[PDB]
């Protein structure tokens, strides 16, 4: 295993489709193409993929993260993590942690004041990853994910 992390190439249609395939598998209710278009075409520099260079398919992405950033209120830039997926065979190797680190590092260099995400209250794996990075729970949303349960809103202050 020789995992390589790289930014999204918007000109690569095949890279675009592999990301959508990878993210849609884990979602109970998938995203349309224009959900993906909204993130990747407007913020191409905030999407990252992870590839296994020593695998049989080196160019295929086995993990990915999708982000955006927009002014919040009027005076602060809020980074947002909308999508995070790691292939089932590659779980438990620190790939997701590295993808979150490289994305947050990019948004910090783009002068984001804070990072925001939502996740399930029952997603222990996601809570451990984020809270161990400094995220804290700022809100609980009632049945945000319907029958999957409530959500936590996590914020990591950078400034």
């Amino acid at each position: 295993m020789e995992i390589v992390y790289k930014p999204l190439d918007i000109r690569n249609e095949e890279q675009f489709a592999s990301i959508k395939k990878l993210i849609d598998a884990d979602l109970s209710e998938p995203y349309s193409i224009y959900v993906y278009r909204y993130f990747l075409n407007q913020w191409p520099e905030l999407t990252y993929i992870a590839v296994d260079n020593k695998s049989g398919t080196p160019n295929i992405p086995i993990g990915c993260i999708v982000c955006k950033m927009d002014p919040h209120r009027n005076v602060r830039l809020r980074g947002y993590i909308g999508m995070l997926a790691v292939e089932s065979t590659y779980r438990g190797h620190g790939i997701a942690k590295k993808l979150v680190e490289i994305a947050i590092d990019k948004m910090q260099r783009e002068h984001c004041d804070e990072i925001m995400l939502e996740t399930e209250v029952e997603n222990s794996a996601a809570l451990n990853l984020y809270e161990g990075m400094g995220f804290i729970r700022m809100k609980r949303m009632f049945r945000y994910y319907l029958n999957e349960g409530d959500a936590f809103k996590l914020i990591l202050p950078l400034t």
Binding site: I10, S32, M133, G134, L156, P157, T159
Partner: protein, 725 residues
């Protein structure tokens, strides 16, 4: 398709268009020139709007690809399936359990009530105008079942009116995706609906043969009649409990009937058909498993019955405590939660039909301060009255929104208090302060119930609430001292009278004294005994927070926890994380949010940095305080519970819990359990860690905020647990 109208309709699909030109080839050529990153769109348009779009030829996002069985595809409402009685009852039973799944289990309207083909059929004829929509020639399907569908359809329309009031948040507390159904005034009135159900009852009673299925269908019909009567509590503000009691009895009767018989509705009677063919802007959604019994109707009836009790209130404190406890122990049914503010704040702009908004507000100030304030239509009083009503409505929100509602309140109470202060209106300024500081405390402790705070943040939050509780206790202490001075002033008049002899000056002193006793003394005594209860309540809160703080300091003294994130991270710092947590209280002037350095220094005073024998002596003082203070807390809770059981006329405590007596007792019982568990847990921690130091190969522990099953989880137990792998 093999059907006739489908074949002929294909010819007329493009008839509405005079002329059509194929543009496929042009679109591709133009798209080829475009760059991969490019998107052609309206400049005004925001691509975020496209994130809620459907996608054709995607099973999970395309409603047209829903797979249906032949029974689902070809189900006909006009066919009377066999056996009719067994099938009509099964249909009616499933519809009622669909209602429970809708309202009690928060399932969508399309997959519950709208999944029934008869409801879809009945609603469609009402939209056009105006007798059941379908005719089978059988009396059970056409009259009995037709009445059932009308009853449920009348119910959903009433639910729609409740949601229109904006009391709760749609698609969170209650889903109303009615797939574009507007019945205007075509749906009949309440009298017609009950008569239709009553006529069907008389039909059922006429039947000579007695079957288990018939008995259930008789009860099913009576249940629907009760649900149709739910609107009486708003149209007439009725407090009568007859139809609610009948709903409970009928639900219990059916629950015992369930195991004895078997119900199988006609295949295709309930399906995802309406999602596939009716106008639908949403993705397909599977039908969720329905409740097995009718216990959900029992919960609905009891929750609504609790709502109606507030009409019996005779004081501001009785309404206040009703709002504090009626939805506190567990979340009430959404219908009851919507019903309460609509029942509490009525159509004639009155509260409970007794007082106006400003009269209701001045009642709270009078009971808290024991003062009649000598303009009318004052803007500050008007604003404060609206703020108080919003406070009551927030109590009816779900367990998450309840905490969120205080965010808005804390900054508005603060601004209100500063505006009273600038005009030197100190009585209203004082009552505003009590509400704000109480809300700050309630907002903070509620975060533990929602598991918002991580274990390392437990010291910051618990010590902050301790700090807030200390200022609230100081303020309430001064308030009671001022009340005592006024009481003693009246008492001293009586002393002065005894020393006097008959004269004109004694006449005047007796006149002043009798006025005070007749108009002031009784309220002063009640406020004194009320403030006595508040002081005991707030000292319990203060003691519990302090106990938690000591528990945290003991864990940190053993090296098991820190007041910051243990995991090192490059991106943020601990001061930024601390300020984010306390950001809601940053703009409140009094009491000022302590600076970050005060939080750190206070912890250092609590933490035992000593080692060896010195450590053991300091640790023993901390554990002895936890055990000692828990017992004092238990004694204080016991005195409060005795006061609740005895009533407000015993002369020592005034709790105003007459309407929520059982619930307030149940709450303090849960609080007493948490208190005992805090003491028991402290002993376990100390016994465990002393043994652990001795062992070089000690276990690696983590601290978790554990909820006590029968306790009150504003104060979770800081529990050790072995970290595994």
């Amino acid at each position: 398709p093999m059907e006739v109208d489908s074949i002929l309709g294909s010819l007329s699909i493009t008839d509405d268009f005079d002329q059509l030109v194929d543009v496929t080839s042009l679109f591709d050529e133009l798209c080829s020139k475009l760059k991969p990153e490019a998107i052609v769109k309206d400049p005004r348009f925001d691509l975020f709007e496209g994130t809620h779009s459907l996608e054709v030829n995607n099973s999970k996002l395309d409603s047209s690809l829903i797979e249906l069985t032949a029974e689902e595809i070809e189900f006909d409402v006009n066919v009377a399936y066999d056996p009719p009685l067994a099938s009509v009852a099964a249909i009616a039973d499933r519809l009622l359990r669909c209602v429970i799944s809708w309202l009690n289990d928060y399932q969508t309207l399309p997959t519950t009530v709208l999944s029934c083909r008869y409801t879809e059929s009945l609603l469609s004829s009402l939209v056009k105008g105006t007798g059941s929509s379908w005719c089978t020639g059988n009396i059970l399907y056409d009259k009995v079942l037709g009445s059932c569908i009308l009853g449920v359809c009348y119910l959903t329309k009433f639910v729609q009116k409740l949601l229109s009031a904006g009391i709760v948040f749609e698609e969170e507390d209650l889903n109303f995706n009615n797939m574009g159904f507007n019945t205007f005034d075509n749906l009949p009135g309440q009298d017609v609906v009950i008569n239709s159900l009553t006529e069907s009852l008389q039909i059922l009673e006429a039947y000579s043969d007695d079957s288990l299925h018939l008995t259930m269908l008789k009860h099913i019909l009576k249940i629907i009649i009760c649900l149709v009567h739910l609107e009486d509590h708003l149209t007439d503000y009725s407090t009568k409990t007859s139809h609610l009691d009948e709903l409970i009895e009928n639900a219990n009767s059916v629950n015992g009937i369930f195991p004895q018989l078997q119900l199988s509705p006609p295949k295709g009677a309930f399906s995802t058909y309406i999602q596939k063919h009716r106008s639908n802007q949403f993705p397909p959604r599977k039908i969720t498993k329905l409740p097995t019994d009718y216990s959900g109707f029992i919960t609905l009836a009891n929750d609504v019955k609790t709502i109606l009790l507030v009409d019996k209130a005779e004081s501001a404190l009785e309404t206040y405590q009703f709002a504090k406890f009626f939805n506190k122990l567990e979340q009430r049914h959404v219908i009851a939660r919507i019903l309460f503010p609509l029942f509490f704040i009525r159509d004639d702009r009155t509260v409970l039909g007794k007082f106006s908004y400003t009269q209701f507000y001045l009642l709270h100030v009078k009971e808290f301060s024991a003062q009649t304030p000598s303009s009318i239509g004052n803007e500050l009083i008007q604003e404060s009255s609206n703020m108080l009503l919003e406070w009551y409505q927030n109590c009816s929100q779900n367990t998450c929104r309840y905490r969120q509602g205080f965010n808005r309140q804390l900054i508005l109470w603060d601004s209100l208090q500063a505006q009273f202060e600038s005009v030197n209106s100190q009585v209203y300024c004082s009552w505003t302060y009590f509400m704000k500081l109480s809300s700050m405390i309630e907002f903070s402790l509620k975060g533990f119930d929602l598991d918002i705070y991580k274990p390392f943040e437990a010291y910051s939050m618990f010590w902050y609430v301790y700090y807030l509780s200390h200022h609230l206790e100081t303020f309430l202490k001064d308030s009671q001292n001022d009340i005592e001075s006024n009481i003693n002033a009246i008492h001293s008049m009586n002393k002065k009278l005894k020393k006097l002899k008959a004269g004109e000056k004694k006449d005047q002193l007796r006149l002043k004294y009798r006025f005070a006793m007749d108009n002031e003394m009784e309220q002063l005594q009640a406020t004194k005994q009320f403030l006595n209860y508040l002081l005991k309540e707030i000292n319990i809160t203060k003691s519990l927070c302090l106990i938690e703080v000591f528990q945290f300091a003991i864990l940190k003294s053993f090296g098991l926890i820190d007041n910051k994130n243990s995991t090192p991270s490059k991106f943020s710092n601990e001061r930024l994380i601390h300020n984010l947590r306390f950001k809601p209280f940053n703009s409140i002037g009094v009491p000022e949010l302590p600076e970050y350095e005060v939080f750190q220094q206070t912890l250092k005073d609590f933490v035992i940095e000593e080692k060896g024998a010195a450590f053991d002596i300091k640790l023993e003082r901390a554990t002895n305080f936890i055990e000692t203070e828990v017992r004092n807390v238990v004694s204080s809770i016991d005195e409060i519970m005795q006061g609740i059981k005895g009533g407000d006329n015993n002369g020592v405590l005034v709790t105003g819990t007459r309407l929520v007596q059982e619930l307030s007792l149940e709450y303090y019982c849960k609080l007493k359990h948490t208190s005992k568990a805090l003491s028991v847990n402290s002993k376990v921690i100390v016994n465990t860690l002393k043994k652990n130091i001795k062992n070089k190969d000690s276990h690696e522990y983590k601290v978790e905020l554990v909820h006590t099953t029968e306790g009150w989880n504003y104060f979770p137990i800081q529990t050790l647990r072995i970290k595994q792998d």
